[PDB]
Amino acid sequence: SMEQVAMELRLTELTRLLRSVLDQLQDKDPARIFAQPVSLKEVPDYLDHIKHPMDFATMRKRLEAQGYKNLHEFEEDFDLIIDNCMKYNARDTVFYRAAVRLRDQGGVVLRQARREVDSIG
Numbered sequence: 001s002m003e004q005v006a007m008e009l010r011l012t013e014l015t016r017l018l019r020s021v022l023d024q025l026q027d028k029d030p031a032r033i034f035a036q037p038v039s040l041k042e043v044p045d046y047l048d049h050i051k052h053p054m055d056f057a058t059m060r061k062r063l064e065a066q067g068y069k070n071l072h073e074f075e076e077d078f079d080l081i082i083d084n085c086m087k088y089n090a091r092d093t094v095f096y097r098a099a100v101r102l103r104d105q106g107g108v109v110l111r112q113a114r115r116e117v118d119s120i121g
Contacts, residue, residue: 014117015066018074021113022063025078026056028105033098034081038088049088054080071117075110082106 029035037055038046046053059077068074085099 010121011066011069013120014068014070015063017113017116017120018063018068018071021074021109022056022059024109025102025106028102028109029056029098031094031098033095034085034102046088050084052080052084054078054084056081071114078106078110 026035034056036057038050038053040046054077059074059081062068062077063074068077082099082103086096089095089099
């Protein structure tokens with residue numbers, strides 16, 4: 001149907017915007033602390049601590065299968081990145097501090113993305 005097609009075009013346009021949001025968020029992590037999943041080889045106990053791991057590569061795979069239906073879903077995954085890190089790592093660590101900075105800086109980007117997703121429908 002033409003209705004199905006139009007909905008598909010909306011998903012595609014959302015996917016384009018989310019891709020640019022994702023690149024912008026990831027620039028706020030120049031150390032690449034959040035680039036890839038935490039290694040279970042190097043943190044074998046990780047899953048006893050963190051129930052839903054997340055990282056920018058895993059977000060990117062989901063995005064390219066057009067797997068975010070809305071901005072809320074994408075933000076949930078971004079928040080997991082930050083929130084997982086601030087629980088597993090202590091306050092006085094380079095990891096925790098990188099999460100705080102990503103959160104603060106990413107908030108600006110997400111504030112306007114929310115306006116762009118509302119605005120362009």
